[PDB]
Protein backbone atom coordinates (compact mmCIF):
# COMPACT_ATOMS: atom_id res chain seq x y z
CA UNK A 1 0.00 0.00 0.00
CA UNK A 2 2.67 2.39 -0.63
CA UNK A 3 1.79 5.74 -2.27
CA UNK A 4 2.03 7.06 -6.01
CA UNK A 5 4.86 9.07 -5.88
CA UNK A 6 3.38 11.85 -7.52
CA UNK A 7 5.94 13.94 -6.84
CA UNK A 8 8.26 12.37 -9.61
CA UNK A 9 5.93 13.86 -12.14
CA UNK A 10 4.65 16.56 -10.24
CA UNK A 11 7.35 18.02 -8.51
CA UNK A 12 10.00 17.11 -11.15
CA UNK A 13 12.69 19.22 -11.92
CA UNK A 14 12.71 19.09 -15.79
CA UNK A 15 9.87 18.45 -18.76
CA UNK A 16 9.95 17.20 -21.81
CA UNK A 17 9.88 18.86 -25.01
CA UNK A 18 6.02 18.37 -25.99
CA UNK A 19 7.34 17.17 -29.46
CA UNK A 20 9.15 14.26 -27.18
CA UNK A 21 6.32 14.13 -24.77
CA UNK A 22 7.09 11.67 -21.56
CA UNK A 23 4.97 9.35 -20.76
CA UNK A 24 5.16 7.30 -17.08
CA UNK A 25 3.21 4.50 -15.63
CA UNK A 26 1.52 4.56 -12.80
CA UNK A 27 0.64 1.31 -11.04
CA UNK A 28 0.80 -0.79 -8.06
CA UNK A 29 -0.14 2.33 -5.23
CA UNK A 30 -2.23 3.98 -3.39
CA UNK A 31 -3.46 7.42 -5.40
CA UNK A 32 -4.20 10.56 -4.20
CA UNK A 33 -5.71 13.19 -6.35
CA UNK A 34 -7.82 14.97 -3.54
CA UNK A 35 -4.09 16.17 -2.35
CA UNK A 36 -3.68 18.39 -5.70
CA UNK A 37 -7.60 18.94 -6.31
CA UNK A 38 -6.90 20.94 -3.27
CA UNK A 39 -3.70 22.33 -3.57
CA UNK A 40 -5.05 25.42 -5.79
CA UNK A 41 -1.50 25.43 -7.01
CA UNK A 42 -3.03 24.87 -10.24
CA UNK A 43 -4.66 26.61 -12.85
CA UNK A 44 -6.62 24.50 -14.82
CA UNK A 45 -7.90 21.49 -13.16
CA UNK A 46 -10.52 20.00 -15.68
CA UNK A 47 -11.86 16.33 -16.53
CA UNK A 48 -13.07 15.21 -19.60
CA UNK A 49 -13.60 11.62 -17.63
CA UNK A 50 -15.13 11.06 -14.33
CA UNK A 51 -15.59 14.69 -12.37
CA UNK A 52 -12.45 15.53 -10.20
CA UNK A 53 -13.53 14.54 -6.93
CA UNK A 54 -16.12 11.76 -7.92
CA UNK A 55 -13.41 9.61 -9.13
CA UNK A 56 -11.87 9.45 -6.35
CA UNK A 57 -13.95 6.66 -5.31
CA UNK A 58 -12.52 4.45 -8.19
CA UNK A 59 -10.04 2.33 -8.61
CA UNK A 60 -8.26 1.60 -11.86
CA UNK A 61 -5.91 -1.15 -13.28
CA UNK A 62 -3.26 1.64 -14.56
CA UNK A 63 -2.79 5.24 -14.76
CA UNK A 64 -1.01 7.10 -17.47
CA UNK A 65 1.07 10.36 -17.07
CA UNK A 66 1.83 12.59 -20.05
CA UNK A 67 4.27 15.33 -18.93
CA UNK A 68 4.62 18.27 -21.52
CA UNK A 69 5.42 22.53 -21.39
CA UNK A 70 3.15 24.39 -23.63
CA UNK A 71 2.04 28.07 -24.16
CA UNK A 72 -1.20 28.98 -21.73
CA UNK A 73 -3.03 29.60 -24.65
CA UNK A 74 -2.53 26.32 -25.80
CA UNK A 75 -3.99 24.27 -23.02
CA UNK A 76 -7.37 24.58 -24.29
CA UNK A 77 -6.01 22.33 -27.08
CA UNK A 78 -5.51 19.43 -24.46
CA UNK A 79 -8.43 17.68 -24.92
CA UNK A 80 -10.49 15.43 -26.91
CA UNK A 81 -12.03 16.65 -30.45
CA UNK A 82 -9.39 19.62 -30.36
CA UNK A 83 -7.17 21.14 -33.63
CA UNK A 84 -4.22 23.11 -33.64
CA UNK A 85 -0.31 23.01 -33.71
CA UNK A 86 -0.01 21.15 -30.84
CA UNK A 87 -3.37 18.99 -31.11
CA UNK A 88 -2.64 17.52 -34.46
CA UNK A 89 1.37 17.50 -34.47
CA UNK A 90 2.79 17.18 -31.12
CA UNK A 91 0.14 15.52 -28.68
CA UNK A 92 -3.30 13.91 -29.17
CA UNK A 93 -6.35 13.19 -26.86
CA UNK A 94 -8.70 10.47 -28.86
CA UNK A 95 -12.25 11.14 -28.67
CA UNK A 96 -13.19 8.74 -26.36
CA UNK A 97 -10.56 9.90 -23.97
CA UNK A 98 -11.12 9.52 -19.81
CA UNK A 99 -9.39 11.28 -17.67
CA UNK A 100 -8.09 14.34 -16.29
CA UNK A 101 -5.94 17.45 -17.41
CA UNK A 102 -4.14 19.20 -15.26
CA UNK A 103 -1.95 23.09 -16.36
CA UNK A 104 0.47 24.81 -13.69
CA UNK A 105 2.14 27.83 -14.31
CA UNK A 106 6.01 27.45 -14.62
CA UNK A 107 7.14 30.83 -15.80
CA UNK A 108 9.05 31.21 -12.72
CA UNK A 109 10.91 28.01 -13.27
CA UNK A 110 11.13 27.75 -17.09
CA UNK A 111 10.76 31.19 -18.47
CA UNK A 112 15.00 32.72 -18.83
CA UNK A 113 15.93 36.03 -19.23
CA UNK A 114 17.71 35.45 -22.35
CA UNK A 115 14.96 33.23 -23.52
CA UNK A 116 14.31 29.33 -22.57
CA UNK A 117 14.37 27.72 -26.25
CA UNK A 118 14.89 24.34 -24.64
CA UNK A 119 11.36 23.59 -24.93
CA UNK A 120 10.20 22.21 -28.62
CA UNK A 121 7.45 21.88 -30.28
CA UNK A 122 6.62 20.04 -33.54
CA UNK A 123 5.79 22.64 -36.42
CA UNK A 124 5.49 20.50 -39.52
CA UNK A 125 4.56 16.91 -40.21
CA UNK A 126 3.28 14.93 -43.22
CA UNK A 127 0.43 14.00 -41.41
CA UNK A 128 -1.78 14.54 -38.14
CA UNK A 129 -0.95 12.42 -35.21
CA UNK A 130 -2.75 9.72 -34.14
CA UNK A 131 -3.90 9.48 -30.15
CA UNK A 132 -1.21 9.38 -28.04
CA UNK A 133 1.27 8.91 -31.00
CA UNK A 134 4.31 10.42 -30.25
CA UNK A 135 6.48 11.46 -33.32
CA UNK A 136 10.62 12.03 -32.27
CA UNK A 137 11.45 12.07 -35.91
CA UNK A 138 13.84 15.21 -36.55
CA UNK A 139 14.28 14.26 -40.54
CA UNK A 140 13.92 17.43 -42.76
CA UNK A 141 10.88 18.09 -43.43
CA UNK A 142 9.37 18.15 -46.66
CA UNK A 143 7.38 20.39 -49.34
CA UNK A 144 6.45 20.41 -52.64
CA UNK A 145 7.56 18.06 -56.04
CA UNK A 146 11.00 18.37 -55.68
CA UNK A 147 12.46 15.77 -53.23
CA UNK A 148 14.26 17.22 -50.15
CA UNK A 149 18.24 16.69 -50.07
CA UNK A 150 18.06 16.45 -46.30
CA UNK A 151 19.85 20.12 -46.39
CA UNK A 152 17.59 23.10 -44.87
CA UNK A 153 16.57 25.82 -47.31
CA UNK A 154 13.58 26.27 -49.70
CA UNK A 155 10.70 23.75 -49.44
CA UNK A 156 13.06 21.74 -46.72
CA UNK A 157 12.90 22.66 -43.10
CA UNK A 158 13.95 21.16 -40.04
CA UNK A 159 9.79 20.20 -37.80
CA UNK A 160 10.86 21.34 -35.03
CA UNK A 161 10.53 25.17 -33.70
CA UNK A 162 11.73 26.34 -30.63
CA UNK A 163 9.43 28.47 -27.65
CA UNK A 164 10.58 31.66 -26.55
CA UNK A 165 9.64 31.59 -23.09
CA UNK A 166 10.63 34.77 -21.58
CA UNK A 167 9.57 36.05 -17.80
CA UNK A 168 8.25 39.04 -19.37
CA UNK A 169 5.57 37.06 -21.49
CA UNK A 170 2.51 38.22 -21.04
CA UNK A 171 -0.09 34.97 -19.89
CA UNK A 172 -1.15 33.28 -22.90
CA UNK A 173 2.73 33.37 -23.80
CA UNK A 174 4.14 31.94 -20.17
CA UNK A 175 4.80 28.18 -20.72
CA UNK A 176 2.42 25.98 -18.49
CA UNK A 177 3.29 22.17 -16.96
CA UNK A 178 1.00 20.42 -18.15
CA UNK A 179 0.28 16.43 -16.99
CA UNK A 180 -2.35 14.25 -18.49
CA UNK A 181 -3.70 11.88 -16.75
CA UNK A 182 -5.23 8.95 -18.28
CA UNK A 183 -6.99 6.09 -16.77
CA UNK A 184 -7.45 2.60 -18.00
CA UNK A 185 -9.96 -0.36 -17.22
CA UNK A 186 -8.15 -3.53 -18.42
CA UNK A 187 -9.77 -6.67 -18.22
CA UNK A 188 -7.47 -7.27 -14.76
CA UNK A 189 -7.48 -6.45 -11.17
CA UNK A 190 -7.40 -2.84 -10.15
CA UNK A 191 -4.03 -1.88 -8.81
CA UNK A 192 -4.17 1.82 -8.43
CA UNK A 193 -6.74 2.88 -5.46
CA UNK A 194 -6.95 5.84 -3.39
CA UNK B 1 -6.93 32.39 -58.19
CA UNK B 2 -3.50 33.05 -56.00
CA UNK B 3 -2.56 37.16 -55.42
CA UNK B 4 -0.57 39.36 -53.85
CA UNK B 5 -1.48 42.91 -52.93
CA UNK B 6 1.46 44.98 -51.57
CA UNK B 7 0.70 48.81 -49.74
CA UNK B 8 0.86 51.56 -51.64
CA UNK B 9 3.76 54.39 -51.99
CA UNK B 10 5.55 55.71 -49.77
CA UNK B 11 7.83 58.87 -49.60
CA UNK B 12 10.31 59.47 -47.02
CA UNK B 13 13.26 61.31 -45.78
CA UNK B 14 16.75 59.81 -45.09
CA UNK B 15 17.91 58.74 -42.10
CA UNK B 16 14.18 57.36 -41.50
CA UNK B 17 12.37 53.76 -41.78
CA UNK B 18 10.13 52.50 -44.29
CA UNK B 19 7.64 49.77 -43.80
CA UNK B 20 5.59 47.38 -46.65
CA UNK B 21 3.22 45.46 -46.06
CA UNK B 22 2.41 42.26 -48.55
CA UNK B 23 -0.91 39.96 -48.17
CA UNK B 24 -1.95 37.03 -48.83
CA UNK B 25 -5.09 35.66 -50.33
CA UNK B 26 -6.16 32.32 -51.92
CA UNK B 27 -3.63 29.75 -51.11
CA UNK B 28 -2.40 28.29 -47.75
CA UNK B 29 -0.41 30.64 -46.05
CA UNK B 30 0.95 28.54 -43.19
CA UNK B 31 2.83 26.35 -46.13
CA UNK B 32 4.92 28.99 -47.86
CA UNK B 33 6.88 31.31 -47.39
CA UNK B 34 7.63 34.80 -48.53
CA UNK B 35 11.20 36.49 -50.50
CA UNK B 36 11.77 40.25 -50.14
CA UNK B 37 13.13 41.67 -53.39
CA UNK B 38 13.89 45.76 -54.99
CA UNK B 39 14.13 47.31 -58.26
CA UNK B 40 15.80 50.33 -58.89
CA UNK B 41 14.28 51.90 -61.84
CA UNK B 42 16.68 50.21 -65.14
CA UNK B 43 18.51 47.92 -62.60
CA UNK B 44 18.57 44.65 -61.63
CA UNK B 45 16.54 42.70 -58.90
CA UNK B 46 18.27 42.68 -55.95
CA UNK B 47 16.97 40.08 -53.27
CA UNK B 48 16.94 41.36 -49.48
CA UNK B 49 15.38 38.60 -47.42
CA UNK B 50 13.17 36.13 -46.73
CA UNK B 51 10.72 34.75 -44.15
CA UNK B 52 9.41 31.02 -43.64
CA UNK B 53 5.26 31.95 -42.15
CA UNK B 54 5.09 28.91 -40.19
CA UNK B 55 8.33 29.13 -38.09
CA UNK B 56 9.22 33.34 -38.56
CA UNK B 57 12.44 32.58 -39.68
CA UNK B 58 14.55 34.47 -41.84
CA UNK B 59 17.43 35.04 -43.31
CA UNK B 60 19.40 38.32 -45.35
CA UNK B 61 21.95 39.61 -47.77
CA UNK B 62 24.70 40.82 -46.31
CA UNK B 63 24.22 44.25 -47.45
CA UNK B 64 20.92 44.44 -45.56
CA UNK B 65 22.39 42.89 -42.03
CA UNK B 66 20.61 44.68 -39.21
CA UNK B 67 19.25 47.34 -41.77
CA UNK B 68 16.05 45.18 -42.46
CA UNK B 69 13.65 42.83 -40.64
CA UNK B 70 11.00 40.51 -41.61
CA UNK B 71 7.89 39.78 -39.92
CA UNK B 72 4.73 38.23 -40.35
CA UNK B 73 1.13 38.01 -38.83
CA UNK B 74 -0.90 35.15 -39.91
CA UNK B 75 -4.13 36.24 -38.23
CA UNK B 76 -3.97 38.96 -40.54
CA UNK B 77 -2.42 36.54 -43.52
CA UNK B 78 0.24 39.51 -44.05
CA UNK B 79 4.30 39.72 -44.09
CA UNK B 80 5.79 42.58 -43.47
CA UNK B 81 9.04 44.41 -43.91
CA UNK B 82 10.68 46.78 -42.67
CA UNK B 83 14.40 48.90 -43.56
CA UNK B 84 15.89 51.01 -41.50
CA UNK B 85 18.54 54.20 -42.19
CA UNK B 86 17.47 54.91 -45.66
CA UNK B 87 19.41 56.72 -48.09
CA UNK B 88 18.72 58.29 -51.44
CA UNK B 89 20.19 55.38 -53.30
CA UNK B 90 17.09 52.54 -51.32
CA UNK B 91 15.00 54.55 -53.87
CA UNK B 92 13.47 51.38 -55.68
CA UNK B 93 10.15 49.37 -56.25
CA UNK B 94 9.73 46.61 -53.41
CA UNK B 95 8.19 43.61 -54.58
CA UNK B 96 6.84 40.44 -52.13
CA UNK B 97 6.64 37.33 -53.89
CA UNK B 98 5.57 33.57 -52.95
CA UNK B 99 4.84 30.23 -54.46
CA UNK B 100 1.59 28.94 -54.73
CA UNK B 101 0.39 26.20 -52.16
CA UNK B 102 -2.34 24.20 -51.96
CA UNK B 103 -3.38 21.96 -48.48
CA UNK B 104 -1.42 19.54 -49.96
CA UNK B 105 1.72 20.77 -51.42
CA UNK B 106 3.66 24.04 -52.04
CA UNK B 107 5.34 24.90 -55.81
CA UNK B 108 9.21 24.99 -56.21
CA UNK B 109 9.66 28.57 -57.20
CA UNK B 110 8.22 31.71 -56.77
CA UNK B 111 4.87 31.66 -59.00
CA UNK B 112 3.18 34.64 -57.70
CA UNK B 113 4.64 38.30 -57.14
CA UNK B 114 2.72 41.13 -55.34
CA UNK B 115 2.00 44.43 -57.90
CA UNK B 116 4.93 45.93 -56.07
CA UNK B 117 5.23 49.16 -53.73
CA UNK B 118 7.16 52.44 -54.77
CA UNK B 119 9.45 53.79 -52.32
CA UNK B 120 11.45 57.11 -52.53
CA UNK B 121 13.85 58.67 -50.14
CA UNK B 122 14.32 62.39 -50.64
CA UNK C 1 27.33 35.09 -51.32
CA UNK C 2 27.11 33.26 -54.42
CA UNK C 3 27.57 35.04 -57.92
CA UNK C 4 25.70 34.92 -61.48
CA UNK C 5 26.48 36.62 -64.43
CA UNK C 6 24.51 36.48 -67.15
CA UNK C 7 25.36 36.42 -71.20
CA UNK C 8 24.84 38.22 -73.68
CA UNK C 9 23.77 41.06 -71.39
CA UNK C 10 22.13 42.13 -74.57
CA UNK C 11 20.45 40.29 -77.65
CA UNK C 12 18.94 41.61 -81.01
CA UNK C 13 16.39 39.20 -82.62
CA UNK C 14 13.87 38.85 -85.04
CA UNK C 15 10.63 37.75 -84.36
CA UNK C 16 10.15 34.14 -85.03
CA UNK C 17 13.86 33.49 -84.74
CA UNK C 18 15.39 30.79 -82.09
CA UNK C 19 16.81 32.42 -79.17
CA UNK C 20 19.83 31.46 -76.16
CA UNK C 21 19.97 33.61 -73.10
CA UNK C 22 22.48 32.40 -70.54
CA UNK C 23 24.34 32.29 -67.19
CA UNK C 24 27.11 31.32 -65.05
CA UNK C 25 27.58 30.72 -61.24
CA UNK C 26 30.74 31.44 -59.65
CA UNK C 27 30.67 27.84 -58.66
CA UNK C 28 28.47 25.22 -59.04
CA UNK C 29 25.39 23.54 -56.71
CA UNK C 30 22.62 22.18 -57.90
CA UNK C 31 20.08 22.62 -60.68
CA UNK C 32 17.48 22.10 -57.95
CA UNK C 33 17.52 25.65 -56.56
CA UNK C 34 17.75 27.44 -60.40
CA UNK C 35 14.81 29.40 -61.35
CA UNK C 36 14.39 32.00 -64.72
CA UNK C 37 11.84 35.06 -64.28
CA UNK C 38 10.56 37.38 -67.15
CA UNK C 39 9.59 40.95 -66.79
CA UNK C 40 8.65 43.55 -68.94
CA UNK C 41 8.64 47.62 -67.83
CA UNK C 42 5.84 48.29 -65.55
CA UNK C 43 4.83 44.67 -64.17
CA UNK C 44 6.18 42.36 -61.23
CA UNK C 45 8.69 39.69 -62.82
CA UNK C 46 6.85 36.26 -63.38
CA UNK C 47 8.14 32.60 -63.39
CA UNK C 48 9.11 31.12 -66.51
CA UNK C 49 11.25 27.83 -65.25
CA UNK C 50 12.23 26.57 -62.43
CA UNK C 51 14.14 23.70 -60.96
CA UNK C 52 15.94 24.25 -64.26
CA UNK C 53 13.91 22.75 -66.67
CA UNK C 54 10.22 22.34 -65.24
CA UNK C 55 7.46 24.83 -66.70
CA UNK C 56 5.68 27.25 -64.56
CA UNK C 57 1.61 26.48 -65.05
CA UNK C 58 0.41 28.38 -68.29
CA UNK C 59 4.26 28.88 -69.87
CA UNK C 60 4.14 27.65 -73.69
CA UNK C 61 5.93 24.56 -74.54
CA UNK C 62 8.69 27.01 -76.60
CA UNK C 63 10.06 27.70 -73.47
CA UNK C 64 12.22 24.91 -71.90
CA UNK C 65 15.58 25.52 -69.35
CA UNK C 66 18.89 23.83 -69.77
CA UNK C 67 22.51 23.03 -68.70
CA UNK C 68 24.10 21.81 -65.65
CA UNK C 69 26.40 21.91 -62.86
CA UNK C 70 27.69 26.37 -63.29
CA UNK C 71 26.70 26.69 -66.45
CA UNK C 72 22.52 26.97 -66.90
CA UNK C 73 20.49 28.39 -69.97
CA UNK C 74 17.00 29.28 -70.82
CA UNK C 75 15.76 28.99 -74.78
CA UNK C 76 13.05 29.76 -76.62
CA UNK C 77 12.37 27.56 -79.78
CA UNK C 78 10.72 30.78 -81.87
CA UNK C 79 10.16 34.17 -80.73
CA UNK C 80 6.82 35.56 -80.62
CA UNK C 81 6.37 39.75 -79.74
CA UNK C 82 5.02 38.56 -76.28
CA UNK C 83 8.61 36.93 -75.82
CA UNK C 84 10.37 40.28 -75.71
CA UNK C 85 11.50 41.14 -72.47
CA UNK C 86 13.98 41.64 -69.66
CA UNK C 87 14.89 38.26 -68.03
CA UNK C 88 16.74 37.16 -64.86
CA UNK C 89 17.99 34.12 -63.22
CA UNK C 90 18.05 33.39 -59.25
CA UNK C 91 19.68 30.74 -57.51
CA UNK C 92 17.69 29.84 -53.89
CA UNK C 93 20.60 27.12 -52.62
CA UNK C 94 20.81 26.38 -48.59
CA UNK C 95 19.77 30.03 -48.29
CA UNK C 96 22.01 32.89 -47.45
CA UNK C 97 21.73 32.53 -50.61
CA UNK C 98 19.24 33.89 -53.36
CA UNK C 99 21.17 35.93 -55.31
CA UNK C 100 20.21 37.31 -58.80
CA UNK C 101 22.23 37.82 -61.99
CA UNK C 102 22.79 40.68 -63.55
CA UNK C 103 19.85 40.41 -66.31
CA UNK C 104 19.47 40.23 -69.81
CA UNK C 105 17.43 41.78 -72.42
CA UNK C 106 16.26 40.76 -76.01
CA UNK C 107 15.30 43.44 -78.19
CA UNK C 108 13.32 43.25 -81.61
CA UNK C 109 15.50 43.81 -84.23
Known amino acids: TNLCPFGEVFNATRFASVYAWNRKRISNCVADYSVLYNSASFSTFKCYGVSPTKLNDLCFTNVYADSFVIRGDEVRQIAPGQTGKIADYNYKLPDDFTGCVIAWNSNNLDSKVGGNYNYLYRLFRKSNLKPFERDISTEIYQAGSTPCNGVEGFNCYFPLQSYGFQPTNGVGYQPYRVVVLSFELLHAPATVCG | QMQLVQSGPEVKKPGTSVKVSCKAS????????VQWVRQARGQRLEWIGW????????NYAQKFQERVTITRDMSTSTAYMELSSLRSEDTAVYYC????????????????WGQGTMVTVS | EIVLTQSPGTLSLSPGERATLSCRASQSVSSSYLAWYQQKPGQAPRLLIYGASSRATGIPDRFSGSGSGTDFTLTISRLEPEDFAVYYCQHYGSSRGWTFGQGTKVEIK
Open chain 2, 26 to 33: GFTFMSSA
Open chain 2, 51 to 58: IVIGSGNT
Open chain 2, 97 to 112: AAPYCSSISCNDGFDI
